[PDB]
UniProtKB/Swiss-Prot annotation, chain A:
GO BP, one annotated term: translation
Any single GO CC term annotated in Swiss-Prot or TrEMBL for this entry: large ribosomal subunit
Species of the source: Staphylococcus aureus (strain NCTC 8325 / PS 47)
Family in the record: Belongs to the bacterial ribosomal protein bL32 family.
Disulfide bridge partners, by residue number: none
GO function term, MF aspect, one: structural constituent of ribosome
Keywords, in A-Z order: Ribonucleoprotein, Ribosomal protein
Protein name: Large ribosomal subunit protein bL32
Swiss-Prot record, chain B:
Family listed: Belongs to the bacterial ribosomal protein bL34 family.
Pfam family, one: Ribosomal_L34
Protein name as it appears in the record: Large ribosomal subunit protein bL34
Entry GO terms, CC: ribonucleoprotein complex; ribosome
Record flagged with keyword Membrane: no
Keywords for this protein: Ribonucleoprotein, Ribosomal protein
GO molecular function: structural constituent of ribosome
Region span, Disordered: 1-44
Taxonomic lineage of the native organism: Bacteria, Bacillati, Bacillota, Bacilli, Bacillales
Swiss-Prot record, chain C:
Protein's gene: rplQ
Keywords attached to this entry: Ribonucleoprotein, Ribosomal protein
SUPFAM superfamilies membership: Prokaryotic ribosomal protein L17 (SSF64263)
Organism in which the protein naturally occurs: Staphylococcus aureus (strain NCTC 8325 / PS 47)
GO cellular component, one term: cytosolic large ribosomal subunit
Protein name: Large ribosomal subunit protein bL17
Swiss-Prot record, chain D:
Family stated for the protein in its record: Belongs to the universal ribosomal protein uL22 family.
Transmembrane segments: none
Source organism of the structure: Staphylococcus aureus (strain NCTC 8325 / PS 47)
Oligomer and partners: Part of the 50S ribosomal subunit.
Keyword Plastid carried by entry: no
Classification lineage: Bacteria, Bacillati, Bacillota, Bacilli, Bacillales
Protein name: Large ribosomal subunit protein uL22
RNA sequence: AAGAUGAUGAGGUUAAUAGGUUCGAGGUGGAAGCAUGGUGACAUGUGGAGCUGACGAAUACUAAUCGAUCGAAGACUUAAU
RNA sequence: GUACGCGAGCUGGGUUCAGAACGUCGUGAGACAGUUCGGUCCCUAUCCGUCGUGGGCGUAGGAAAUUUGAGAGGAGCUGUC
RNA sequence: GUGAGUCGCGAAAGACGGGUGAGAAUCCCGUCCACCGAUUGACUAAGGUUUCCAGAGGAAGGCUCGUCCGCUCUGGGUUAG
RNA sequence: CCGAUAGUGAACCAGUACCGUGAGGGAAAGGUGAAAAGCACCCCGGAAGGGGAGUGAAAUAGAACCUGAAACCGUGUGCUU
RNA sequence: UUAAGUUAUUAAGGGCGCACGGUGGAUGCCUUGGCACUAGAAGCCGAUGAAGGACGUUACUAACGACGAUAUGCUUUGGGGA
């Protein structure tokens, strides 16, 4: 329904340890000298 | 629904207008009160 | 099997896609739609290499009754050209064209995006 | 040495950006360009404009080379708050709080 | 074969993982077209025909690339040795 | 027995509402030892708890497999011939 | 500030191509598909009072975006025996 | 006697903007600098914006411009977990 | 090498303190404007058409103010002197 209490600064931050994003995996082109994704296309 | 205030210029140009107010002592008094303050607008 | 939308909208989508891809022989879409249409169009070329009446009578069950064409100041309704030009290419070959290219993502929807041929 | 480049009161909230910063807080430059340019987010391209500017002036004014450069510290801070309303049932309202950000990036060779 | 996600499991070209192909199982119940006979609606023969989602064998024909990351070098003391 | 177990799980027939009527008491407004038809049941679950499922670290070098059982839980019915 | 990157994002069928553009699920053209059809169609009156047209813009709004707009700037548009 | 949440309700385009049909009710809102000398010109970018450059005694006084606290929000790190 | 025993390192992330920014606009200083009073003056206008308003006038004017188709003011007399 509702909270009873002010969520602190701490558990607010502990609640967010897994809010990240895993960086993409990249690969330099075959002789075009720049990165792009794996099993994707370069554009 | 039918909401209130289905407007019309004629009834408004009437009752809440001027010539009524300036055709009754009461209305004259009203316009006075609206002057001593200083109001840009009358009959509205 | 796979679901994009409701039932009718699904098949009419597909009919517009295989009816597409054939004026201009390559498109760009979400990835999934490319997969189910992969299945479909492969069934089409495998069908299109017979040439029977009944093959036309069966192919029309998804293509659109009308799709005008102009390439060399000429005319083709996606079916003339199918059964004159397309199967002619892949006579030697088995059904199993239609590669897929994971072209890239999209910005507004975060959508994956592709092209197929 | 050092170098920096800033945007000011650009129209994105901090958090949604703050992530994309913590991707690259430490790494070499062009690797970071790669890291930004791909991620399916609206917060990315802007920041590439920022960083790219930091390289422009880091070369023009301070006479550096792109090789030894990394991102030692980058961050975002709050800006003003565009306060707006949404209507809501039974006459009430509940006011949106649109926010902004003052993005800050600081290149460094680390050397002198 | 698992499943909300992630996880799990089969697989990733030295390859049958999925798709398609050809076959098949089962389902459906005699395709269109032709010919015949009926003025006709209709039937008969072509013919267990033809069609077929998830199912099942062979088939690399297509796509599973290339690439990147993480990850130990063995504490001390005593007793055997 | 556990808020005569449980309404942030359900229902609302009853019941402490507004209407109306019967008997009765009251001069009257109106009210009952009573009776009768109808009469709106809100909530996006924060913490604890619970059901399930995962990441990190540790388990004196780093990994793939297999397994013991400290303990815990579930099962425990009965008839006829 | 927390709640929370959560609830919701206000009925409904769109898809493709080509262009413009710093940049397009959403903008313009074309193509098909679908929806209303005693009516989401058409002419009027009340009512509102410049929203109308064209050219430029895209910080604010527009429940996303936006090269676009009933938004911003400049100019222009309403004729009665 | 006040020196900007005080004093007028109002230090500024105030009985205005706005709410109401209408009597009527009714706001908030001060400070660049000595002087505007208000950042030529260069670089990045579409612009916004920024860094350089310079004016000025000073720009961490550059117009959402004297000072600029706290809440709140981040960055980094010495001890610890 | 073998056994027995003890101990730590880790920090995903958080904590305490220190430094540096950001928001936001308290405090400090100031004042254009107000408050209450003194002394004095004055204390009503209007058919000779009031008070108050509308609409319009500046080369460029959206508003305030001035003004009224002689319109962002005309003539006169006095003062001032750029």
């Amino acid at each position: 329904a509702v909270p009873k209490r002010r969520t602190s600064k701490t558990r607010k931050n502990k609640r967010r340890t897994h809010f990240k994003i895993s960086v993409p995996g990249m690969t330099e082109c075959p002789n075009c000298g720049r990165e792009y994704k794996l099993s994707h296309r370069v554009c | 629904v039918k909401r209130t205030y289905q407007p019309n210029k004629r009834k408004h140009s009437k009752v809440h207008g001027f010539r009524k107010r300036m055709s009754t002592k009461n209305g004259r008094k009203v316009l006075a009160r609206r002057r001593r303050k200083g109001r840009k607008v009358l009959s509205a | 099997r796979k679901l994009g939308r409701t039932s009718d909208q699904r098949k009419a989508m597909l009919r517009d896609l295989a009816t597409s891809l054939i004026i201009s022989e390559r498109i760009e879409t979400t990835e999934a739609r490319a997969k189910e249409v992969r299945s479909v169009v492969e069934k089409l070329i495998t069908l299109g290499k017979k040439g029977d009446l009944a093959s036309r009578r069966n192919a029309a069950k998804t293509l659109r009754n009308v799709e005008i064409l102009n390439e060399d100041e000429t005319t083709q309704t996606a079916l003339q050209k199918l059964f004159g030009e397309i199967a002619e290419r892949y006579t030697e070959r088995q059904g199993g064209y239609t590669r897929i290219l994971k072209q890239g993502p999209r910005r507004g929807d975060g959508a994956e995006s592709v092209i197929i041929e | 040495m050092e170098a920096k480049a800033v945007a000011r009161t650009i129209r994105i909230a901090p958090r949604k950006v703050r992530l994309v910063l913590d991707l690259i807080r430490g790494k070499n430059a062009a690797e970071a360009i790669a890291i930004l340019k791909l991620t399916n987010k609206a917060s990315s391209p802007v920041i590439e404009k920022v960083l790219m500017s930091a390289l422009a002036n880091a070369e023009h004014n301070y006479d550096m080379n792109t090789d030894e450069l990394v991102v030692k510290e980058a961050y975002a801070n709050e800006g003003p708050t565009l306060k707006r309303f949404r209507p809501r049932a039974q006459g009430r309202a509940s006011a949106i709080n649109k926010r902004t950000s003052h993005i800050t990036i600081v290149v460094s060779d680390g050397k002198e």
